[PDB]
A paper describes a structure:
For 10077d from [name], the N-terminal His6 tagged full length protein gave crystals and a structure, whereas the C-terminal His6 tagged version yielded neither. In none of the three X-ray structures of full-length UPF0201 proteins was electron density corresponding to the 15–20 C-terminal residues observed. The loop connecting β2 and β3 protrudes somewhat from the globular domain, and the electron density corresponding to this region is poorly defined in the 10077b and 10077d structures. Our four UPF0201 structures represent subfamilies N149845 (10077a, b) and N130963 (10077c, d). The crystallographic asymmetric units contain one protomer in 10077c, two in 10077b and four protomers in both 10077a and 10077d. While 10077a, 10077b and 10077d all form one type of dimer (typeI), 10077c forms altogether different dimer via crystallographic symmetry (typeII). The interface surface area for type I dimers in 10077a, 10077b and 10077d are 672, 563 and 611 Å2, respectively.
UPF0201 family proteins constitute one such uncharacterized, archaeal specific protein family. The UPF0201 family proteins occur as a single globular α/β domain with approximate dimensions of 55×35×35 Å3. The protomeric structure consists of a five-stranded, anti-parallel β-sheet, five α helices, which are located on one face of the β-sheet, and three loops connecting helices and strands. We have further documented that all members of this archaeal specific protein family share a common polypeptide chain fold, which is evolutionarily related to the RRM motif found in the ribosomal L5 proteins and many other RNA-binding proteins.
Residue numbers in the entry:
A (entry chain A): 4 to 42, 51 to 144
B (entry chain D): 3 to 144
C (entry chain C): 4 to 41, 51 to 143
D (entry chain B): 5 to 143
The structure:
């Protein structure tokens, strides 16, 4: 299958500095991207060019390191009924340049749309196994 | 691509007005059963006002309702299309006001009049961009 | 100088309750009167000087301070056939208050003035009759 | 009381900043200053920002009264939506039609390029309904 798209987002609170929440986000990009600011506001990034998607991903696994193995263990609970694989990153650490997973409720959300032929949960789960490695 | 998070349909009832008569001009816009919240407050001047709002939050209704509205409105939907940029505010809400009177008589007509039936529709897209938004709204005019 | 007549008209849109419209018109009649039903219009006309006189009195009474505003603009309110115009808040009227309104849905109140002859000069003077 | 009043507007590459400023004039019954700057538009294009700030209740109150006056029966539309025009920073938003403003007329606008008119609403007991009701007061 393939990765239809990649969506990265985060939330900015009243006591939070937007530029800072965006700096935390730029930590997940090895190339230029664009952030969309909306209104408590949202910072939203998207990836459609397969090149960038493919390049973003390989880079994310590289920066995750050993944590890339913990995704695998959870692929089943991470992928939803719309075949979107969800990966929660630590906002604060990312700000500090570090890429790490988090179970917290205010993470930098990374979402990937998976497409298999056809979209069979057993296929998507496997495409992701191969993917996270 | 995107969705209409919600839909709000409202009108005002003046001292000389009949709630039931108005509630009817409201229903002209609906092809299915619906509720109607009723608030009260002092109008622009000091006159006691009555507010009537109908909000659709079930995708189901939203879409059937929007298909209908477009159905009824018909040939004016092209005007909605050429004037999109002046109907959608910076909060991504699409605004459509109908002639309250012609409505009472089951006729949907866009109006610039001072006392119409306001129809807002929140449109949401990813990313949330004026661009992605206007593109979506332009689609809604199926 | 006399008031030939006095007629008070109002309108009722599809969404309006014709009765509530009329209960707002009666706010200016200190006596019996009938409504001529012609959206639809509602009219009333006074021909007896008594009523025409009772109407004008009670009118300025209710307007109060506002009676001075009219007193300001006669040349304008007075039309060609020496007919004087007063439009008032239909909404406040229904509540029981007379207020001139620039609004676009008033309760029009006009009355023809008659001078001898109806010279636009002496007519305006008679119009300023206010006290 | 009303903390501050700020009237801003945007200028696109193909627009005349003089014309845009004139349209802002339509809103003032007294002399004012326009503070220029740079920005991005809804489509990400290089824009010029024009803002006017009022702090003196003198000018403030005079402004609001006039504004309300010019608006006329249109203020009924504001009141029926009062909640939305109010953000969590307690600012009252009244969005004015730029083009009509330029043609010297004051009207509301539902589009995405108005002449923004914001108001910092302050209630001694400072709450949601506190300001929301205070808004009504300005009628």
């Amino acid at each position: 299958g393939k990765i239809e798209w990649v969506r990265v987002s985060a939330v900015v609170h009243s006591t939070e500095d937007r530029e800072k929440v965006g700096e935390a986000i730029s930590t997940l990009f090895p190339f230029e991207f664009e952030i969309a600011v909306s209104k408590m506001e949202y910072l939203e990034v998207e990836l459609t060019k397969s090149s960038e998607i493919k390049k973003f991903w390989k880079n994310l696994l590289e920066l995750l390191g050993e944590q890339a193995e913990e995704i695998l263990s959870t692929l089943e609970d991470r992928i939803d009924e719309q075949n979107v694989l969800h990966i929660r990153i630590d906002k604060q650490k990312a700000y500090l340049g570090e890429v790490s997973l988090t179970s917290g409720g205010d993470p930098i959300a990374v979402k990937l749309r998976l497409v298999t032929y056809p979209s069979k949960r057993e296929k998507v789960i496997e495409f992701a196994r191969e993917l996270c490695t």
